[PDB]
Ligand SMILES: O=C(O)c1nn[nH]c1-c1ccccc1
């Protein structure tokens with residue numbers, strides 16, 4: 001079984017872990033525990049807004065929702081290469097729920113965050129919250145594989161996940177989207193005290209829950225919290241904060257991505273054939289320091305073991 005080397009994640013352990021998980025085996029509770037406490041410490045020290053500089057020769061890969069589709073997560077790393085200092089990643093929330101290999105996804109992602117803390121980035125989604133985990137399978141999965149106490153620890157680690165990432169002061173990445181009120185700025189995002197369950201309304205809620213709409217202005221959300229926001233909302237926010245565009249995730253898309261609001265609101269979704277039912281393609285994005293324009297890479301689902309969606 002995979003073991004830490006002097007209580008630390010190594011590239012060797014991560015390879016063993018991914019193979020262990022491919023073969024439907026469980027990471028020992030002590031190792032899971034250690035990954036969680038160590039990554040909690042890493043994440044707790046980060047700003048709510050992660051601000052990353054991408055030099056002219058450097059690239060980054062942005063992935064959207066993964067939703068416990070562990071075998072598709074491995075496929076991303078086979079198509080795009082494993083994470084490293086020279087192949088950095090952002091995973092933009094919704095790692096868990098729906099898919100029945102959520103534990104394997106999230107421990108794999110936290111492992112890589114510990115191995116490459118400055119080059120492997122995790123942003124919180126609305127599915128990294130208690131109400132979602134309780135309904136949509138992650139709580140059950142953690143209780144089935146480990147204990148109720150292990151779940152409380154996951155919840156507490158999720159609370160320290162940052163809420164957005166800004167690349168070169170120009171691309172802003174969040175899970176959900178923009179805001180239900182006008183005049184919200186990067187300063188406000190930086191100052192969100194994020195170690196909690198999201199409020200019923202406010203900036204923290206919007207970052208996890210909001211959705212673009214084609215028509216101008218805002219609308220009440222079909223989801224019951226946050227809002228739908230139009231092209232004029234995006235345009236104004238970006239002009240006021242000196243940004244080029246936003247990358248969001250949150251929603252399933254048939255092509256794995258959507259380019260909305262005149263090129264200014266991009267969706268990226270990385271869970272192909274969502275819940276073994278939707279038949280959508282997935283995508284990941286490349287960005288370069290010399291060119292911040294998104295390059296999309298589409299991909300289709302790979303086989304996984306016979307465990308149905310939402311089993312837990
Ligand atoms: O479940 C999903 O696909 C999802 N991804 N982001 N938000 C949701 C969601 C949350 C609550 C109810 C329905 C969908």
Ligand SMILES: [Mn+2]
Nearest residue numbers: 094125126250
């Ligand atoms: Mn979501």
Ligand SMILES: [Mn+2]
Nearest residue numbers: 065094250251
């Ligand atoms: Mn989602």
